[PDB]
């Protein structure tokens, strides 16, 4: 049933389409792309309807059941366009034994990536442009009259904006970017009611971010929660630039104060890590770097799995046998090239690495540490502030096939870590 796609333009569909699909099928459609190429996937037809517990289509950011799940679809609803620069996008088509449906029809394009203007990261991520789909926007709740839906929260939208069922600080507008993205800025508006002509706007809000949409981090500014100041009228746009660029997939806007009701229109700004030169995700997340390539110094519990160290995908983390081991005695090793950095994550009370060293090799037997000139010793990299939110740590491009991360300082819970390596082919 399974197929691989590498040609510039292609078609993907359920077996026998336009006929209804055969029962008890489990096929994988994998699209592969060269570095600097983006995968565009567009569905033309989709009928799987009967929890998708019968017939479903899974879209995977990487290898299925290794890389993160983008979405599961089982309706008459065509999935929205996807732009992947992971280099690999996979579909799993699962059919049951009852009521064969019409299936799905889709097409893909491999397009050369064009990095934005310089290497600027203030690109609108697609709220106004529609690049973010309606599917990608959700909310805690919506107003009863149904005239203020999450899908009306697009910046400069002409029909009200998003309003929740109640005005409280527990309500939020959520956007799933589908893939890990750099976030640098947020633009918000209020809304003047089409009916009453009443002006509703958020005066201040908090930012919550997640990589899986389960573990959340409130974007803190210092040691306390950052409270962004928003709009003072229902029409004018207010842009808040993040003082420290964020790496995330799920964005939540939680209003804290408002004028006469919560109304929100929104734009998100950022870019992809891959927009920067020689910054491809080398396969820890996607599963392109298989289990056989992941090793660690130690490992809490016998017969550990190597797919627990994967950045984002892993719903746990890497743990050393010793909870509290001495610095420089524990390490995670990846066998892969030019390496220009890593992305470090904590583990899902809570464990994350606060300072770390990096060592690299071509041999696997002779190792070097990235050296800070000032120290005359291996450079000491800033780690994470939080167990979920990843931190990208770039360094001077170094050629290697083996990379090790040595935890130096960590949270009171101890060493917990998930990891990706960044770089490109020679």
């Amino acid at each position: 049933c399974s197929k691989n796609f590498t040609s510039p333009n292609g078609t993907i569909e359920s077996p026998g389409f336009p006929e209804k699909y055969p029962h008890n099928l489990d096929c994988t459609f994998t699209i592969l792309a060269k570095p600097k190429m983006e995968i565009i996937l567009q569905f033309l037809i989709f009928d799987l309807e009967h929890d998708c517990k019968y017939d479903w289509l899974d879209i995977w950011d990487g290898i299925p059941h290794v890389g993160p799940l983008i979405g599961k679809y089982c309706g008459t609803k065509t999935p929205s366009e996807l732009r992947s620069s992971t280099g690999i996008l996979s579909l799993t088509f699962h059919t049951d034994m009852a009521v064969a449906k019409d299936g799905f029809s889709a097409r893909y394009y491999l397009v050369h990536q064009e990095p934005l203007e310089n290497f600027q990261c203030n690109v609108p991520l697609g709220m106004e442009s529609g690049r973010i789909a309606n599917e990608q926007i959700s909310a805690s709740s919506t107003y009863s009259d149904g005239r203020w839906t999450p899908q009306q929260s697009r910046l400069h939208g002409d029909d009200n904006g998003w309003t929740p069922n109640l005005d409280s600080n527990k309500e939020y507008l959520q956007v799933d970017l589908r893939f890990l993205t750099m976030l640098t800025a947020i633009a918000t508006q209020g809304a003047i009611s089409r009916e009453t002509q009443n002006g509703y706007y958020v005066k201040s809000y908090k930012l919550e971010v997640s990589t899986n949409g389960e573990d959340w981090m409130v974007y803190r500014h210092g040691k306390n929660h950052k409270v962004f100041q928003a709009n003072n009228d229902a029409t004018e746009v207010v842009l808040n630039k993040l003082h420290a660029p964020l790496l995330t997939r799920f964005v939540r806007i939680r209003p804290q104060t408002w004028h006469s009701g919560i109304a929100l229109r929104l734009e998100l700004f950022g870019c992809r890590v891959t927009d920067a030169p020689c910054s491809n995700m080398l396969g820890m997340l996607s599963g392109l770097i298989a289990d056989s390539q992941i090793s660690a110094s130690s490992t809490q519990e016998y017969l550990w799995s190597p797919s627990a160290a994967r950045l984002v995908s892993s719903r746990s983390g890497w743990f050393p046998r010793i909870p509290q081991a001495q610095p420089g005695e524990e390490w995670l090793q990846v066998d892969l090239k030019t390496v220009k950095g890593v992305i470090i994550q904590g583990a899902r009370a809570r464990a994350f690495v606060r300072k770390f060293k990096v060592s690299y090799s071509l041999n696997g037997k002779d190792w070097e540490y990235i050296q800070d000139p000032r120290t005359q010793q291996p450079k000491l990299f800033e780690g994470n502030m939080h167990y979920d939110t990843p931190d990208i740590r770039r360094f001077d491009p170094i050629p290697a096939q083996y990379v090790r991360v040595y935890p130096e300082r960590w949270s009171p819970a101890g060493i917990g870590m998930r990891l990706e390596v960044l770089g490109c082919d020679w």
Epitope: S144, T163, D167, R194, E195, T196, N198, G199, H259, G261
Partner: antibody, heavy 121, light 109 residues
Framework: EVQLVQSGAEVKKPGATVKISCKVS????????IHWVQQAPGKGLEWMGR????????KYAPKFQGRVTITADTSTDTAYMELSSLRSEDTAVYYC??????????????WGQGTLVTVSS | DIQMTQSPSSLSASVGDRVTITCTAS???????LHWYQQKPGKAPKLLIY???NLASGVPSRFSGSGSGTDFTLTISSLQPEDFATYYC?????????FGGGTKVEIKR
């Protein structure tokens, strides 16, 4: 319990101006919305206008435009309707009303008792 | 603007009787935006129903309303002497807000 208390009845000569008072109380809170309605003796409810108390963003009916000014004092929870260039037909009961907080549907939940203006010479 | 017309203007109906007042719109009003008010002779209007004539507010059970788009209704299942008043419908689907002419309920006795 939200309660609006209006000014007393007045007689005002034709071509004069009348300001009447709507004292919001009971639940109050900021972001109150005040609307003025005119009931002619004959009958009918006619919407003069509304005011965002926090932001001075009055909306007026085209009929009373030019001739009605709505003001809010945030310090004392009182809203005012000023009717310029009075007419014989302006003799009516003027009501002030407010909707509930979260209602984007703007039903007039609470009303004032009514102020009678008798435009007479 | 969207003009509102309440058809029956005067109703003499006896006590304990089912009465029905129409309200009808020049355009289409969203269900959630039609409201109803009761005005006793010497008093300010009081809210009866606030969404599509569906949602009654701390008020007697006899009062019902229904409708969609153009035609909305207010119904008193057992009319009572207390219920003698003028009844107004209001729309806030598009500003400016508009009221109906009113229906003056009277009682046979």
């Amino acid at each position: 319990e939200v309660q609006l208390v209006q000014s007393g009845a007045e007689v005002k000569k034709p071509g004069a101006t009348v300001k009447i008072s709507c004292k919001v109380s009971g639940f109050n809170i900021k972001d109150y919305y005040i609307h003025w309605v005119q009931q002619a003796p004959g009958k009918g409810l006619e919407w003069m206008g509304r005011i965002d108390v926090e932001d001075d963003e009055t909306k007026y009916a085209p009929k009373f435009q030019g001739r009605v000014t709505i003001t809010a004092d945030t310090s004392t929870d009182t809203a005012y309707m000023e009717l310029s260039s009075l007419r014989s037909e302006d003799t009516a009961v003027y009501y002030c009303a407010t909707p509930i907080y979260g209602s984007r549907e703007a039903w007039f939940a609470y009303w004032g008792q009514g102020t009678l203006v008798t435009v007479s010479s | 603007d969207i003009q509102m017309t309440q058809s029956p203007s005067s109703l003499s109906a006896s006590v304990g009787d089912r009465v029905t007042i129409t309200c009808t719109a020049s355009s289409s009003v969203s269900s959630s935006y039609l409201h109803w008010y009761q005005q006793k002779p010497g008093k300010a209007p009081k809210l009866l129903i606030y969404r599509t004539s569906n949602l009654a507010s701390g008020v007697p059970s006899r009062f019902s309303g229904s409708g969609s788009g153009t035609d909305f209704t207010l119904t008193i299942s057992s009319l009572q002497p207390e219920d003698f008043a003028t009844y107004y419908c209001h729309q806030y689907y598009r500003s400016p807000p508009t009221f109906g002419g009113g229906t003056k309920v009277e009682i046979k006795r």
